[PDB]
Design a protein around this nucleic acid. Structure first.
Lengths: 150, 80, 123, 205, 129
RNA sequence: ACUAUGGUUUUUAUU
RNA sequence: AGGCGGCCCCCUGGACGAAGACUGACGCUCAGGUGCGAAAGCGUGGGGAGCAAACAGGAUUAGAUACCCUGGUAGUCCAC
RNA sequence: ACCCGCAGAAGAAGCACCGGCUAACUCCGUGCCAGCAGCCGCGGUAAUACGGAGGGUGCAAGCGUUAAUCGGAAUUACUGGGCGUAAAGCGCACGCAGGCGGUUUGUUAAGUCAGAUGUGAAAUCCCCGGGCUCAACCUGGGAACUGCAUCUGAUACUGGC
RNA sequence: UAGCUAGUAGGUGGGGUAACGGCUCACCUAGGCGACGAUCCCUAGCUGGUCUGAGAGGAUGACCAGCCACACUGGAACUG
């Protein structure tokens, strides 16, 4: 169907004259509910404005994934500078499992049968960029049936 | 048909006895690579003709002597 | 490790050992008590603290903490000792029990009556 | 184990009616609802977002009168059935004996039905049962002992059950005091206040 | 001199396509030629040729198409220090059906398909996708 | 071709 | 490898190429082992121009224990 | 064991939490003092954190507390960690043995894989006929034990010669 | 815990034992053990099973189906 998720609202130190001033950052995922994923981030002096500046970017660029029979085919890896994410096909509904920097990226793409591990990195804005790599590394069999002989 | 082990002679300094190192090539109890762990055995020999560096085949009885139950059934190859 | 490593020297476990070893894996034991002391307030934490020297049933002699307002503890009282850390004191691992033996209860208590020795002593 | 505390005060914390201890004393007039919970419970929210998913979970527990370790057992016993596990949790809580004895009209409330079960008045397939958590199936015969078939409290609950709108997946006759399931409870005749989205993923932190 | 001839064969193939080269060459062996046979016969390479009698040498002609890379993952799994074996009931799956597996069996270098159609198990030669 | 000695504690996070 | 520099004569390990000829797996890493010293310090003698721990001679300074400044032993050097 | 009946509301409740994380809150006392205990941290007059209240929230013939120990712990890491600054490349060498070893014919068939014959009692995990109301528990039918041993084949790749 | 044995190491004719073996006597021999750890010494019963993870692994062998080994503390074996 159509999922739409907020992953993390975080503080920032923002050290200034007089000590510190109030500031927040937000991370959201929207995409197109099935087959396309899209994300956004934004920063503001109030939470509802940081969430706006995240959501106003969450359709600006979309990443398409090829599926067959409603989902992805094989266990897959994906990386970003300072983050790695690995994914394994498991039980539908009972195999989810994993936080928003992994699970919510697949929820807005129409996948509910895959579990994920970061094995180190936890900062959501840098982990989500490594989940978004694995979706372009996963190969679906239908449109590649002519890439080798016989 | 008898089930028999092979090894290399490491001492022959006894008029009715030899000492043999068995060609035991086995997988480690917790690790996956195959390794040499050659058993050093005391073996009966009443021909007294084979010597150190020879290759031999052995069979099990019966206890034959003190802490010994294995005997020579073939001299497989001579030194060197 | 390579396909040849750990074959000669297998991996050998590191043991951490007990944080409250004087109790010898028991929950609570009797201590006779000999000396009571006071200590300095720890930098920003503005309160003076109270502790005692206690010999146990197994012959170990340890520093026991005294929590709560009011104390009747002295030489050869014979009281009950427990495992309990105080993260505001240096190396304090052992604490005292109010609900047993010679020990007086904590002053002004009326809530959490199962702890603190709120029930009257026998006479 | 059991819960024995006040039952109306549970509505003050939820902000709506749980329909616990039903009677005309708590219907259509003088009901108040919410107003001033506790002594200071109406100052300022707060609550945050974990309180919402906790209070939905506790609403299921308090309606059917089931404890944390048995509610964890129903979350295991429930099946996903290619949809949501919480849906079959609500089907197991509908099929337990004290809720079935309540639906069949032998007692006017889920707690009145539980008192009849533990006080040895109720039978299953011709034998006495005192376990309120007993799971009922199609064609399991629910009936009553003769010295409770006389009891005006049971007759009045069955006489109210014909003056209220009926559960149509089951058959019952007050003239004999006997009933059976004929179908499963259908979600296109039955309704609920419980948000199924907050009971799908439980006990996984 | 050479401590693993097939690690050099697999490196020469895997990196040769990343150097965009038409062909790659090495000392020839009936193991390298049997691996080249199944790679041609399952359509992953274009040709293999041998020249010489006292110094036999192999040349592999790399396969190219409309897309990018014909060989996308070529993983040995079984090595001369630590070998990995498979049995009839559990003959392996590769990238959920995007790839295939190669085994030496008791007869010669073949696909997991040709092995399960004779009832054979054995050592893994490579997983190819 | 220069000076020993003046201890110690602090704030914005909600809609 | 810490190290090796003004310039000779006499011995010497190793790196590298062009064209030919033999061995015929001779490669490659190394448990334990046996080996290679920079400076300081030492054992045994020789030597001592300049310099220089320690130390003395005078200031500087609260002190001077350091900077300043003249001397000077250990050392700097040699065959081992 | 169990059952069939009968007065009489009769004989039967405590204990811990409620600053933030963490759902349940701020008045009276104390005044950086005293007391705290999963962690961040609390308190010098209006303390949701200490001590008490009244009111909630949670467990309930149990409530709170505790010792060792498995999981998470890839936290002695084949599986599955790390080595320029973080904990670690042997200060630098030559080296045997051990490990690895180009390419090929012939052989042995140990290692591997395919197939027989024997066996792993009973209770217990799993499915199920019975018993008891759920179920602990107890029986009756199914069922799992990669191995080892006596045997049979394959020659790909190594080991052996 | 690096060097250690010498009834230790292998034989011949008898003894003993249900049978076996230096278990043992008299005579012949000079061998045996060690990086795959000899020398030397602290703790500890064993299995079916039991707990734990999805596994490797680690914890646990008390529950009762079988075994161990002790019986004031040590010795001997006799009877069977």
């Amino acid at each position: 169907e159509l999922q739409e998720k907020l992953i993390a609202v975080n503080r920032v130190s923002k050290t200034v004259k007089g000590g510190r001033i109030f500031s927040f950052t937000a991370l959201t995922v929207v995409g197109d509910g099935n087959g396309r994923v899209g994300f956004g981030y934004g920063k503001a002096r109030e939470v509802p404005a940081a969430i706006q500046k995240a959501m106003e970017k969450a359709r600006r660029n979309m990443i398409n994934v090829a599926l067959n029979n409603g989902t992805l085919q094989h266990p897959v890896k994906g990386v970003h500078t300072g983050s790695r994410v690995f994914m394994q096909p498991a039980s539908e509904g009972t195999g989810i499992i994993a936080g928003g920097a992994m699970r919510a990226v697949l929820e807005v793409a129409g996948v509910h049968n895959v579990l994920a591990k970061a094995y180190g990195s936890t900062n959501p804005i840098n982990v989500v960029r490594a989940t978004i790599d694995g979706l372009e590394n996963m190969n679906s069999p239908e449109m590649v049936a002519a890439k080798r002989g016989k | 048909k008898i089930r028999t082990l092979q090894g290399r002679v490491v001492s022959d300094k006894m008029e009715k006895s030899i000492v043999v190192a068995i060609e035991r090539f086995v997988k480690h109890p917790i690790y996956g690579k195959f390794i040499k762990r050659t058993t050093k055995l005391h073996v009966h020999d009443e021909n007294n003709e084979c010597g150190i560096g020879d290759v031999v085949e052995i069979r099990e009885c019966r206890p034959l002597s003190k802490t010994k139950s294995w005997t020579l059934v073939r001299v497989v190859e001579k030194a060197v | 490790a390579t396909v040849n490593q750990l074959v000669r020297k297998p991996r050998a476990r590191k043991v951490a050992k007990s944080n409250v070893p004087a109790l010898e894996a028991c929950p609570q034991k009797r201590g006779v008590c000999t000396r009571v002391y006071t200590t300095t307030p720890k930098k920003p934490n503005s309160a003076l603290r109270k502790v005692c020297r206690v010999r146990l049933t197994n012959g170990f002699e340890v520093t026991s903490y005294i929590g709560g307002e009011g104390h009747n503890l002295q030489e050869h009282s014979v009281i009950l000792i427990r495992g309990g850390r105080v993260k505001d004191l240096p190396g304090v691992r052992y604490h005292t029990v109010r609900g047993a033996l010679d020990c007086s209860g904590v002053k002004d208590r009326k809530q959490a009556r199962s702890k603190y020795g709120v029930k009257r002593p026998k006479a | 184990a059991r819960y024995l505390g006040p039952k109306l005060k549970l509505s003050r914390r939820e902000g709506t009616d749980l329909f616990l201890k039903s009677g005309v004393r708590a219907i259509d007039t003088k009901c108040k609802i919410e107003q001033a919970p506790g002594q200071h419970g109406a100052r300022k929210p707060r609550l945050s977002d974990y309180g919402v998913q906790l209070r939905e979970k506790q609403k299921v527990r308090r309606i059917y009168g089931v404890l944390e370790r048995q509610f964890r057992n129903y979350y295991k016993e429930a099946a996903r059935l290619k949809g949501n596990t919480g849906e079959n949790l609500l089907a197991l809580l509908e099929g337990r004996l004290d809720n079935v004895v309540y639906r069949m009209g032998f007692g006017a409330t889920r707690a009145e039905a539980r008192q009849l079960v533990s006080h040895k008045a109720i039978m299953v397939n011709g034998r006495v049962v005192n376990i309120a958590s007993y799971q009922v199936s199609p064609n399991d015969v629910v009936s009553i002992r003769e010295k409770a078939k006389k009891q005006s409290r049971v007759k009045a609950a069955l006489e109210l059950a014909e003056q209220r709108e009926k559960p149509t997946w089951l058959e019952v006759d007050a003239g004999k005091m006997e009933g059976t399931f004929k179908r499963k409870p259908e979600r296109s005749d039955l309704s609920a206040d419980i948000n199924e989205h907050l009971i799908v993923e439980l006990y996984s932190k | 001199s050479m401590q693993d001839p097939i690690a050099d064969m697999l490196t020469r193939i895997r990196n040769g396509q990343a150097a965009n080269k038409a062909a790659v060459t090495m000392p020839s062996s009936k193991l390298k030629v049997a691996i080249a046979n199944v790679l041609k016969e399952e359509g992953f390479i274009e040709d293999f040729k041998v020249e010489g009698d006292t110094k036999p040498e192999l040349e592999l002609t790399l396969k190219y198409f409309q897309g990018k890379a014909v060989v996308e993952s070529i993983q040995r799994v079984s090595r001369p220090g630590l070998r990995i074996y498979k049995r009839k009931d559990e003959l392996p799956k590769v990238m959920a059906g995007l790839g295939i597996a190669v085994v030496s069996t008791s007869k010669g270098v073949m696909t997991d398909r040709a092995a399960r159609q004779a009832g054979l198990g054995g050592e893994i030669i490579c997983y190819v996708a």
